[PDB]
Design an enzyme around this catalytic site. Structure first.
Site, mmCIF file in Angstrom:
data_model
loop_
_atom_site.group_PDB
_atom_site.id
_atom_site.type_symbol
_atom_site.label_atom_id
_atom_site.label_comp_id
_atom_site.label_asym_id
_atom_site.label_seq_id
_atom_site.Cartn_x
_atom_site.Cartn_y
_atom_site.Cartn_z
ATOM 1 N N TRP A 82 0.778 -1.339 -0.102
ATOM 2 C CA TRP A 82 0.011 -0.053 -0.151
ATOM 3 C C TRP A 82 0.771 1.073 -0.011
ATOM 4 O O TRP A 82 0.509 2.314 -0.231
ATOM 5 C CB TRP A 82 -0.988 -0.057 1.440
ATOM 6 C CG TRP A 82 -1.899 -1.189 1.408
ATOM 7 C CD1 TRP A 82 -1.665 -2.153 2.392
ATOM 8 C CD2 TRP A 82 -2.970 -1.685 0.471
ATOM 9 N NE1 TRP A 82 -2.626 -3.270 1.911
ATOM 10 C CE2 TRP A 82 -3.267 -2.870 1.000
ATOM 11 C CE3 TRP A 82 -3.462 -1.251 -0.785
ATOM 12 C CZ2 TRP A 82 -4.363 -3.856 0.322
ATOM 13 C CZ3 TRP A 82 -4.554 -1.926 -1.432
ATOM 14 C CH2 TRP A 82 -5.008 -3.094 -0.914
ATOM 15 N N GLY A 118 -7.525 5.812 3.670
ATOM 16 C CA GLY A 118 -8.189 6.846 4.476
ATOM 17 C C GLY A 118 -8.069 8.313 4.355
ATOM 18 O O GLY A 118 -8.128 9.058 5.424
ATOM 19 N N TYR A 129 -3.678 -2.076 -8.269
ATOM 20 C CA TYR A 129 -4.556 -1.239 -9.163
ATOM 21 C C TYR A 129 -4.112 -1.518 -10.921
ATOM 22 O O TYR A 129 -4.746 -0.622 -11.486
ATOM 23 C CB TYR A 129 -4.645 0.134 -8.861
ATOM 24 C CG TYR A 129 -4.979 0.212 -7.305
ATOM 25 C CD1 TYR A 129 -5.696 -0.535 -6.637
ATOM 26 C CD2 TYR A 129 -4.424 1.572 -6.512
ATOM 27 C CE1 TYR A 129 -5.850 -0.270 -5.141
ATOM 28 C CE2 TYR A 129 -4.758 1.725 -5.245
ATOM 29 C CZ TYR A 129 -5.323 0.829 -4.728
ATOM 30 O OH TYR A 129 -5.666 1.193 -3.406
ATOM 31 N N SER A 199 -12.749 1.505 0.437
ATOM 32 C CA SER A 199 -12.302 2.424 1.706
ATOM 33 C C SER A 199 -12.759 3.725 1.301
ATOM 34 O O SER A 199 -13.831 4.071 0.975
ATOM 35 C CB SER A 199 -10.896 1.693 2.278
ATOM 36 O OG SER A 199 -10.694 2.148 3.400
ATOM 37 N N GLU A 324 -13.645 -6.966 8.266
ATOM 38 C CA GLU A 324 -13.091 -5.591 7.994
ATOM 39 C C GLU A 324 -12.301 -5.135 8.915
ATOM 40 O O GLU A 324 -11.607 -4.099 8.830
ATOM 41 C CB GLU A 324 -14.664 -4.898 7.844
ATOM 42 C CG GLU A 324 -15.096 -5.153 6.568
ATOM 43 C CD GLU A 324 -14.586 -4.451 5.387
ATOM 44 O OE1 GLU A 324 -13.723 -3.643 5.316
ATOM 45 O OE2 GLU A 324 -14.892 -4.636 4.336
ATOM 46 N N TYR A 327 -7.294 -5.771 10.154
ATOM 47 C CA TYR A 327 -6.208 -5.196 9.788
ATOM 48 C C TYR A 327 -6.023 -3.759 10.547
ATOM 49 O O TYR A 327 -4.910 -3.382 10.885
ATOM 50 C CB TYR A 327 -6.517 -4.525 8.287
ATOM 51 C CG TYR A 327 -5.494 -3.819 7.690
ATOM 52 C CD1 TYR A 327 -4.432 -3.921 7.018
ATOM 53 C CD2 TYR A 327 -5.769 -2.147 7.932
ATOM 54 C CE1 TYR A 327 -3.680 -3.185 6.523
ATOM 55 C CE2 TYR A 327 -4.904 -1.073 7.383
ATOM 56 C CZ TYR A 327 -3.570 -1.544 6.667
ATOM 57 O OH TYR A 327 -2.744 -0.992 6.100
ATOM 58 N N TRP A 429 -0.486 -11.463 5.376
ATOM 59 C CA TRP A 429 -1.006 -11.338 6.954
ATOM 60 C C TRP A 429 -1.472 -12.589 7.497
ATOM 61 O O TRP A 429 -1.598 -13.632 6.857
ATOM 62 C CB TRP A 429 -2.188 -10.356 6.824
ATOM 63 C CG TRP A 429 -2.005 -8.938 6.407
ATOM 64 C CD1 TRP A 429 -2.102 -8.321 5.355
ATOM 65 C CD2 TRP A 429 -1.323 -7.926 7.367
ATOM 66 N NE1 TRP A 429 -1.729 -7.158 5.264
ATOM 67 C CE2 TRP A 429 -1.256 -6.788 6.531
ATOM 68 C CE3 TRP A 429 -0.847 -7.700 8.578
ATOM 69 C CZ2 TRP A 429 -0.886 -5.604 6.997
ATOM 70 C CZ3 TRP A 429 -0.591 -6.477 9.175
ATOM 71 C CH2 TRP A 429 -0.418 -5.557 8.289
ATOM 72 N N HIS A 437 -9.519 -5.887 5.146
ATOM 73 C CA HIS A 437 -9.913 -5.014 4.578
ATOM 74 C C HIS A 437 -8.874 -4.613 3.350
ATOM 75 O O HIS A 437 -7.674 -4.781 3.682
ATOM 76 C CB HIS A 437 -9.729 -3.775 5.507
ATOM 77 C CG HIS A 437 -10.196 -2.323 4.979
ATOM 78 N ND1 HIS A 437 -11.563 -2.070 4.557
ATOM 79 C CD2 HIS A 437 -9.646 -1.186 4.722
ATOM 80 C CE1 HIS A 437 -11.820 -1.054 4.405
ATOM 81 N NE2 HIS A 437 -10.597 -0.252 4.006
#
Ligand SMILES: *[C@@H]1O[C@H](CO[C@@H]2O[C@@H](C)[C@@H](O)[C@@H](O)[C@@H]2O)[C@@H](O[C@@H]2O[C@H](CO)[C@@H](O)[C@H](O)[C@H]2NC(C)=O)[C@H](O)[C@H]1NC(C)=O
EC number: 3.1.1.7
Length: 531
Positions: A82, A118, A129, A199, A324, A327, A429, A437
């Protein structure tokens, strides 16, 4: 190659042929859509890009918007996937177009991706993406854009001209105007634009739905794991002013005009370094600079505009992943870590509720604890770990999504709903986090088709199914196959029946109620108690 030369309204572009196992795609990466929002234009609405002479090379992703870089687990794939993967710059308002090869001779529906993070992070250039598999598979056109995040996109001194707020949303709106004006040059249909986002990107899609000037720029919406009525997605004007003023004082500033004028002298990274300090309390799933209810972009609160809105003629696809909340727990809930099973004590659970539902009264915290406690096993570490995950996921994503979906369906829109329940075989993870999420995205974008990665053969099939559902929805507003006269395999979501499907390796299953018990608490009973 002739198909790699395209003229848009500002001038000529040269794109790049991208490969996939099925066939090539044509991509135009890093197209400038606004003037660089730098120096005196920091914190201001974006201005259209001026035309250019000669050719803009459009073969590389452009810079990421200035933003915080996560260092929780340096080098760990689950967080680094990310993080920015290009250099940071305030010169970052560029968009990307992927189009089938050969270019469509009849205009094809357009999917417009808005990334999440966020409202403080994200980039359209992240590997997850990559638009090439979607476009090759179903031959839609895909657009994605960068928009300003953090203080650069959402610092607001409300009522001012120098920092009116919501300029990251205006970046998105300008890119949508660019698509209306130019996507036909790529074979896209400007009368068939579907926005999709995850998100904060989902929350953004929701805010365009509710803002009349954006509403004429698209026709359908997909909201993955986010909603504009989430407790994190908007701030009030007073809190927005308080955070911007505190940020100014933390960097030494110094009258609204003089305040912003001093903020514009500081290097971008200096603002980023203080970004988190302006949050009032310890929390997960809370972000400093987010859209502000200003009476401008949003005339009223998202909740008020949702309740008052007429949504006839709109189709919406909405959904959540199975876990959700998990994370977010490693970002501040005591006892949680990616490196063990995070089997927490009841003491840690009670302390986690205060971080997971920040700035709420003891009276509300008691109700939350009671709702989510199994009083026959109040001490079971596994149950407590899952319950806190549910607290955070329900409060921030699932119940805001369920609320929006019911009000939309009841007020004219056609709504389809899903829960994504497949845990990637490559997921870095730990297993206790489940399907967290963000981890449907790689399947929606067909990333399993990438031969350089190590997904299973059934996951490649599953990705192709999901690309088909999303493209069906982009084409018709209906994820079902169009030629089907039977009753829909994926039925609409309605405020009464509340049907939704599970997305997994198994065929679709219809279920009812998106965690209806939890959302009766958050959306009806908890509000009534504090009323
Ligand atoms: C699970 O881990 C947390 C966090 O500890 C970190 O992760 C571990 C895997 C290991 O790498 C540690 O060195 C790390 O610090 C544990 O919670 C911590 O517990 C210690 C006491 O042992 C305490 O001093 C810290 O404040 C705690 N941190 C937080 C964020 O709460 C937790 O106890 C571990 N659970 C186990 C081992 O069952």
């Amino acid at each position: 190659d002739a198909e790699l030369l395209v003229t848009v309204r500002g001038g000529r572009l040269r794109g790049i042929r991208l490969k996939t196992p099925g066939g090539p795609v044509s991509a135009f990466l890093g197209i400038p859509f606004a003037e660089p929002p730098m120096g005196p234009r920091r914190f201001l609405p974006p201005e259209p890009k001026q035309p250019w002479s000669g050719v803009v090379d459009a073969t590389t992703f452009q810079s990421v918007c200035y933003q915080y870089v996560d260092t929780l687990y340096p080098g760990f794939e689950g967080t680094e996937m990310w993080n920015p993967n290009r250099e940071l710059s305030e010169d970052c308002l560029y968009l990307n177009v992927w189009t089938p090869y050969p270019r469509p001779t009849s205009p094809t529906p357009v999917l417009v991706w808005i990334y999440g993070g966020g409202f403080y992070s994200g980039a359209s250039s992240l590997d997850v993406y990559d638009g090439r598999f979607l476009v090759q598979a179903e031959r839609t056109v895909l657009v994605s854009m960068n928009y300003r995040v953090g203080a650069f996109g959402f610092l607001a001194l409300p009522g001012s001209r120098e920092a009116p707020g919501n300029v990251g949303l205006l970046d998105q709106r300008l890119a949508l105007q660019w698509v209306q004006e130019n996507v036909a040059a790529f074979g896209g249909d400007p009368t068939s634009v579907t926005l999709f986002g995850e998100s904060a990107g989902a929350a953004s899609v929701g805010m365009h739905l509710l803002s009349p000037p954006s509403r004429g720029l698209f026709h359908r919406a997909v909201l993955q794991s986010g909603a504009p009525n989430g407790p994190w997605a908007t701030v009030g004007m007073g809190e927005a002013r308080r955070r911007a003023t505190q940020l100014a004082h933390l960097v030494g500033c110094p009258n609204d005009t003089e305040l912003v004028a001093c903020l514009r002298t500081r290097p971008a990274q200096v603002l980023v370094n203080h970004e988190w300090h302006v949050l009032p309390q310890e929390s997960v799933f809370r972000f400093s600079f987010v859209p502000v209810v200003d009476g401008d972009f949003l005339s009223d609160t998202p909740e008020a505009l949702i309740n008052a809105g007429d949504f006839h003629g709109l189709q919406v696809l909405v959904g959540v992943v199975k876990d959700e909340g998990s994370y977010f727990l490693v970002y501040g809930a005591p006892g949680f870590s990616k490196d063990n099973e995070s089997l927490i004590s009841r003491a840690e659970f009670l302390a986690g509720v205060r971080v997971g539902v920040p700035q709420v009264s003891d009276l509300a915290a008691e109700a939350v604890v009671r709702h989510y406690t199994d009083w026959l096993h109040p001490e079971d570490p596994a149950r407590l770990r899952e319950a806190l995950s549910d607290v955070v996921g329900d409060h921030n994503v699932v119940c805001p999504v369920a609320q929006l979906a019911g009000r939309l369906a009841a007020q004219g829109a056609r709504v389809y709903a899903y829960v994504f329940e497949h845990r990637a075989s490559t997921l870095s993870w730990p297993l206790w986090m489940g399907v967290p999420h963000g981890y449907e995205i790689e399947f929606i974008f067909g990333i399993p088709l990438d031969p350089s990665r190590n997904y299973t053969a059934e996951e490649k099939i599953f990705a192709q199914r999901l690309m088909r559902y999303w493209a069906n929805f982009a084409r018709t507003g209906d994820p079902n196959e169009p030629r089907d006269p039977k009753a829909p395999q994926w039925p609409p979501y309605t405020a009464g029946a509340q049907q939704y499907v599970s997305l997994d390796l198994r065929p679709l299953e219809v279920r009812r109620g998106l965690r209806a018990q939890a959302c009766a608490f958050w959306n009806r009973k908890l509000p009534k108690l504090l009323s």
